[PDB]
Design a protein around this nucleic acid. Structure first.
Ligand SMILES: [Mg+2]
Ligand SMILES: [Mg+2]
Ligand SMILES: [Mg+2]
Ligand SMILES: [Mg+2]
Ligand SMILES: [Mg+2]
Ligand SMILES: [Mg+2]
Ligand SMILES: [Mg+2]
Ligand SMILES: [Mg+2]
Ligand SMILES: [Mg+2]
Ligand SMILES: [Mg+2]
Ligand SMILES: [Mg+2]
Ligand SMILES: [Mg+2]
Ligand SMILES: [Mg+2]
Ligand SMILES: [Mg+2]
Ligand SMILES: [Mg+2]
Ligand SMILES: [Mg+2]
Ligand SMILES: [Mg+2]
Ligand SMILES: [Mg+2]
Ligand SMILES: [Mg+2]
Ligand SMILES: [Mg+2]
Ligand SMILES: [Mg+2]
Ligand SMILES: [Mg+2]
Ligand SMILES: [Mg+2]
Ligand SMILES: [Mg+2]
Ligand SMILES: [Mg+2]
Ligand SMILES: [Mg+2]
Ligand SMILES: [Mg+2]
Ligand SMILES: [Mg+2]
Ligand SMILES: [Mg+2]
Ligand SMILES: [Mg+2]
Ligand SMILES: [Mg+2]
Ligand SMILES: [Mg+2]
Ligand SMILES: [Mg+2]
Ligand SMILES: [Mg+2]
Ligand SMILES: [Mg+2]
Ligand SMILES: [Mg+2]
Ligand SMILES: [Mg+2]
Ligand SMILES: [Mg+2]
Ligand SMILES: [Mg+2]
Ligand SMILES: [Mg+2]
Ligand SMILES: [Mg+2]
Ligand SMILES: [Mg+2]
Ligand SMILES: [Mg+2]
Ligand SMILES: [Mg+2]
Ligand SMILES: [Mg+2]
Ligand SMILES: [Mg+2]
Ligand SMILES: [Mg+2]
Ligand SMILES: [Mg+2]
Ligand SMILES: [Mg+2]
Ligand SMILES: [Mg+2]
Ligand SMILES: [Mg+2]
Ligand SMILES: [Mg+2]
Ligand SMILES: [Mg+2]
Ligand SMILES: [Mg+2]
Ligand SMILES: [Mg+2]
Ligand SMILES: [Mg+2]
Ligand SMILES: [Mg+2]
Ligand SMILES: [Mg+2]
Ligand SMILES: [Mg+2]
Ligand SMILES: [Mg+2]
Ligand SMILES: [Mg+2]
Ligand SMILES: [Mg+2]
Ligand SMILES: [Mg+2]
Lengths: 54, 112, 213, 116, 121
RNA sequence: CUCGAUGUCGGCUCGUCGCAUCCUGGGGCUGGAGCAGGUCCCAAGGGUUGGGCUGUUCGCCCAUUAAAGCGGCACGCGAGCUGGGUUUAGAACGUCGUGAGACAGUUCGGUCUCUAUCCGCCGCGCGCGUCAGAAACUUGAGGAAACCUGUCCCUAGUACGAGAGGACCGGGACGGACGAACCUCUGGUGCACCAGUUGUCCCGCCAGGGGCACCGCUGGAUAGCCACGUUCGGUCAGGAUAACCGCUGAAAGCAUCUAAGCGGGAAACCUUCUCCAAGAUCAGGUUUCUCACCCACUUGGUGGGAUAAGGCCCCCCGCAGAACACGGGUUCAAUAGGUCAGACCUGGAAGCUCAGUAAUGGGUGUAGGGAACUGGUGCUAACCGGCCGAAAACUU
RNA sequence: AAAUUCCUUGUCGGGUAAGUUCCGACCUGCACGAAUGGCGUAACGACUUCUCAACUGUCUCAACCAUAGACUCGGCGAAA
RNA sequence: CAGGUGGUCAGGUAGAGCAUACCAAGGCGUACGAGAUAACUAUGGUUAAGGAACUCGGCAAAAUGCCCCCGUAACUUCGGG
């Protein structure tokens, strides 16, 4: 099937606005005296030094 | 152990001899014909046990008049009056389904 | 008149009756229940009684629900459901805090068992509605399990509401009627009900004395 | 162990057998492996059972391990060091730690290693 | 046993093999077990016999390969499907039965066949 | 109307509606003794079989059945399927034509495209609302689904009838078709289970094993999913009625079911049974919990900030599942895994030893191996944590 | 009664429980016919047509398993 | 770019074989991945009892299948079949 008509601006924008990134939550970590923030699922790795903070 | 063992235990039977597939067995089955209640006998070879305690079943096979018959009974069924072991078999399987297409000598189980 | 109890489906097994006939039964642990609440027509507009079933750590119950239980003077339970009675209260036969055990039923009576049926996920028309499908050969092209037509033509230029299609199946509330109570084991709080019972093993079940009988 | 529910790793299951054996060999050789999170979660019980065989440590257990592993050096080291090291521990011989995903496909990564 | 199934005749009317035309017992009844009446046609007959190829008959199934559950939880199962050609009054047309039959004929009131059978299991 | 395209018969799948009713239900008349029937009136709740022949619709036949209804919806339905027929190009027969060719004459052959934008429909979420923020349990306006029927026995060989034959009304038993739930049984399946086995390669070799050959093949097979399996269901009773049958009774001193008035009366209708449902914007009810601050200001039913009750995200999972959602658990922990023990499947491991020339067999030993089901065990992971989240008044 | 026969599913026989197709005939050849050959014919045919044995998920009537998609996440990113 | 492209060489075990299976010498893992038991589509597998009842039509599938030894019909153009 092909689109019968081009969608209006409003109708295109309603569907286009729902494509968005989910934001992950960050918790504090103190490694080597310095404080950082990592996602909560990476706390063990951060404390063991397996996370590269660049 | 199972969750329903306490439900099942006052319904199990004793006096049931230990038999394995390949054994020849006499089964004495209660029969109702009108108001008579006699006792029939099924002699055959045990070909299968399907475990599970109270819900365990066994199958015996015999050839009656040029026709093979198989009866499957529940172990612990009260219609079974008793079970007698005639012969011990010597088999390499648990289900002996290959006997379903053997007749005569070829359908014979060893005696150990 | 209407008797009810809440319990858990423990699975099925088989027993032999006095006629030496095998009976497939479902073991329902109709555990003790507490009343915890009475609905009167004067205060609520209908007559019913709550029932509390199931053990749970008190730390697993939030403050509002804990307060509701404290109002009844009962330790919190996991489940809570109302048994609806006839439009006559009779203002009797139930006290808050009273215990209900399995022997409110008797051998040879009939019950209605309601539970939550097992989930089947997203199901096709062939499983969900028993469609036939098209053939497996003789030229059929990629339509073996597909539904076929879903409407007419220019009249009406639409699909009728309630047309049967694919979708989620299961997880419904299901009541099975006229189940025979084979045995009431008051020692273990267990009802042996002849037949099948909706839901998975371990799910919440409501058992009610049958009205059709 | 409990069979995989859903599609197997690396395509078929003949591939999953080899993947699990190779991962187990590398884990016992190095003590610590980085891989995708599903692979590590699938490896954990598989490796723990081999460690249990090594803890029992008879000839039958060694043959049963050699059924799955093909590296005789790793079999020897597992039966000489990893078994006796874990002789006093009742399960839980491995540990899984989640790591930052990788570029390219954003696959979640994890490290699996023996407890000490 | 359903329509188009072929059966072995378990009595001496002279037919050796019948083909099931209809399963009596109601509209659109699907299967027949032990003790069910069948409209059949003769496909093979012994030369010089009572019945003939192409005759339409009524028969009762006495043996079936598919196992049957009995009210006590037992099951019976034979090695072949067999039928007995009967008169309209549920009596056999032959004079003797070959092979064993099931107890279900007792409840389906085929007493003459029950009494003529070599063995009733 | 449509030629800058509205796909043409039959079958399949899925239906939906009408009633001019085929069965089941209710009646009047009968040239209705009874059983059976004929005809007309009411009635659309459900049901309305499988095959042979033909492309067929139609029709005929076979075997059943309570019955094998008639029609509409683009002669319903090809962005759902088929492509046998018709209706392209090849070829042949008969007939017509000098011929090229023609033929509601026949016969063999002959490409069925498309990633769904909108409405529609089936499911599932996110947001906001329901005058504070939340948690639990609920009522039911209003809907959806369901609705079939046979045989046998007693009444009773009675009523009826010369005989033949043979009941109504009531009461039981057993079925067929259909549907729902479930996995105890039977049966199917089984891609990390057990065993045997062929070819080849490898593990140094023997022994023991492994890779590959459709899971190599073969024999079994717990769990889950399932039907061929197991249970249950379509009920009892009310209400208003259809045709029809009345009671009382005038107009019209009689009569008349009707004009006043009151009854009986069916699978149709409404309650009753099952399911959905307060976005039912008239946004319901019964309860329980928090029940509290700070700053700025144009002093505002103002903007921010931080909390409570309570959630959410993250983490460990599920018989919950496309994502999402749902349910359980998070050390005060048996949630998943491991580990120990069972249940169950397979069927007698390895090594050693004895017997045999050997292939092989016996003992050690109901052995060894093993997933899903059950119970113990605090060994591994459920963390040293983030984001949201509570109130102008006023009138009687 | 045909690769030819409209009427037509002609009629009779066989085969099937039931056969507009099939085989053998009849002759009433709409409209057969002798080198645009007539009538036969062993062997041969990815030809057309009818019947049987065996076998089977074609079907009664479906169920389950694995893989590639579909579905989710990250990257690139069209079309009528 | 799953199509097309002439010639030469061409090992082992099994095998009649340059078929087929597994390997050697020698190459290669080839250019989106990672997950996840939805319907549905495709490609394979198994299926109780029945066995063409399917359908225009046994379409598709299933089945047969090898070496050796017996034995083998109508009809025939004497070769066959
Ligand atoms: Mg066993
Ligand atoms: Mg089908
Ligand atoms: Mg096609
Ligand atoms: Mg296609
Ligand atoms: Mg297909
Ligand atoms: Mg319209
Ligand atoms: Mg699985
Ligand atoms: Mg993939
Ligand atoms: Mg393989
Ligand atoms: Mg036009
Ligand atoms: Mg146009
Ligand atoms: Mg009418
Ligand atoms: Mg009448
Ligand atoms: Mg008369
Ligand atoms: Mg109707
Ligand atoms: Mg109604
Ligand atoms: Mg219609
Ligand atoms: Mg049409
Ligand atoms: Mg098309
Ligand atoms: Mg069409
Ligand atoms: Mg269309
Ligand atoms: Mg269209
Ligand atoms: Mg065509
Ligand atoms: Mg032409
Ligand atoms: Mg001419
Ligand atoms: Mg054609
Ligand atoms: Mg309502
Ligand atoms: Mg269902
Ligand atoms: Mg089970
Ligand atoms: Mg089974
Ligand atoms: Mg294995
Ligand atoms: Mg090998
Ligand atoms: Mg060797
Ligand atoms: Mg290899
Ligand atoms: Mg099973
Ligand atoms: Mg009157
Ligand atoms: Mg509404
Ligand atoms: Mg949760
Ligand atoms: Mg041994
Ligand atoms: Mg002629
Ligand atoms: Mg002609
Ligand atoms: Mg003709
Ligand atoms: Mg035929
Ligand atoms: Mg035909
Ligand atoms: Mg002819
Ligand atoms: Mg000519
Ligand atoms: Mg000429
Ligand atoms: Mg000729
Ligand atoms: Mg040729
Ligand atoms: Mg050809
Ligand atoms: Mg993407
Ligand atoms: Mg190329
Ligand atoms: Mg070679
Ligand atoms: Mg090759
Ligand atoms: Mg290879
Ligand atoms: Mg998915
Ligand atoms: Mg089959
Ligand atoms: Mg079979
Ligand atoms: Mg055939
Ligand atoms: Mg047919
Ligand atoms: Mg048909
Ligand atoms: Mg073919
Ligand atoms: Mg094949």
């Amino acid at each position: 099937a092909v689109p019968k008509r081009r969608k209006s601006r409003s109708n295109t924008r309603s569907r286009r606005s729902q494509w968005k990134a989910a934001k992950t939550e960050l918790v504090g970590v103190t490694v080597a005296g310095h404080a950082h923030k990592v996602p909560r699922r990476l706390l063990k790795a951060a404390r063991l030094g397996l996370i590269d903070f660049d | 152990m199972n969750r329903l063992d306490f439900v099942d235990k006052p319904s199990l039977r004793d006096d049931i001899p230990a038999f394995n597939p390949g054994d020849t067995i006499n089964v004495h089955v209660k029969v109702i014909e009108g108001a008579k209640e006699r006792l029939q006998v099924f002699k055959g070879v045990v070909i299968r046990r399907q475990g599970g305690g109270i819900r365990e079943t066994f199958t015996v096979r015999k050839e009656s008049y040029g026709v093979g018959v198989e009866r499957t009974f529940p172990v612990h069924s009260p219609n079974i009056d008793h079970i007698e072991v005639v012969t011990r078999g010597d088999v390499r399987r648990a289900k002996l389904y290959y006997l379903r297409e053997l007749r005569g000598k070829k359908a014979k189980i060893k005696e150990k | 008149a209407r008797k009810g109890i809440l319990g858990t489906k423990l699975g099925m097994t088989q027993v032999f009756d006095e006629s030496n006939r095998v009976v497939p039964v479902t073991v329902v642990k109709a555990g003790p229940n507490v009343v915890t609440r009475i609905r009167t027509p004067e205060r609520d507009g209908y007559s019913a009684v709550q029932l509390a079933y199931g053990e749970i750590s008190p730390r697993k119950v939030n403050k509002p629900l804990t307060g509701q239980y404290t109002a009844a003077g009962v330790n919190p339970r996991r489940y809570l459901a109302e048994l609806r009675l006839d439009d006559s209260d009779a203002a009797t036969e139930y006290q808050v805090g009273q215990e209900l055990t399995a022997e409110i039923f008797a051998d040879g009576s009939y019950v209605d068992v309601t539970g939550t049926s097992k989930g089947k996920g997203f199901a096709g028309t062939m499983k969900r509605h028993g469609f036939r499908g098209q053939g497996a050969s003789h030229g059929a092209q990629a339509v073996h399990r597909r539904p076929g037509s879903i409407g007419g033509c220019a009249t009406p230029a639409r699909v009728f509401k309630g047309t049967r299609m694919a979708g989620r199946m299961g997880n419904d509330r299901v009541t099975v009627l006229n189940l025979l109570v084979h045995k009431v084991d008051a020692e273990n709080g267990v009802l042996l009900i002849k037949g099948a019972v909706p839901g998975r093993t371990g799910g919440l079940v409501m058992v009610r004395s049958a009205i059709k009988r | 162990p409990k069979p995989t529910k859903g599609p197997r790793l690396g395509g078929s299951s003949s591939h999953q057998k080899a993947i699990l054996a190779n991962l187990a060999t590398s884990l016992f050789e190095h003590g610590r492996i980085t891989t995708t999170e599903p692979k590590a979660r699938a490896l954990r019980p598989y490796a723990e059972k081999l460690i249990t065989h090594a803890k029992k440590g008879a000839l039958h257990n060694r043959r049963e391990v050699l059924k799955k592993l093909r590296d005789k050096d790793v079999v020897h080291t597992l039966f000489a060091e990893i078994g006796p090291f874990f002789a006093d521990r009742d399960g839980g011989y491995t540990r899984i730690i989640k790591i930052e995903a990788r570029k390219g496909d954003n696959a979640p990564m994890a490290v699996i290693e023996l407890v000490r | 046993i359903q329509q188009e199934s072929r059966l072995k005749v378990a009595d001496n009317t002279g037919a050796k093999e019948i083909l099931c035309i209809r399963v009596l017992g109601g509209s659109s009844r699907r299967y027949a077990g032990i003790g069910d009446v069948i409209v059949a046609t003769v496909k093979d007959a012994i030369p010089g016999g009572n019945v003939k190829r192409g005759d339409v008959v009524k028969a009762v199934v006495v043996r079936t390969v598919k196992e049957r559950r009995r009210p006590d939880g037992s099951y019976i199962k034979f090695d072949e499907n067999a039928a007995v050609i009967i008169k309209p009054d549920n009596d056999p047309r032959g004079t003797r039965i070959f092979g064993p039959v099931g107890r279900e004929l007792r409840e389906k009131r085929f007493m003459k066949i029950i009494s003529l059978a070599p063995e009733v299991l």
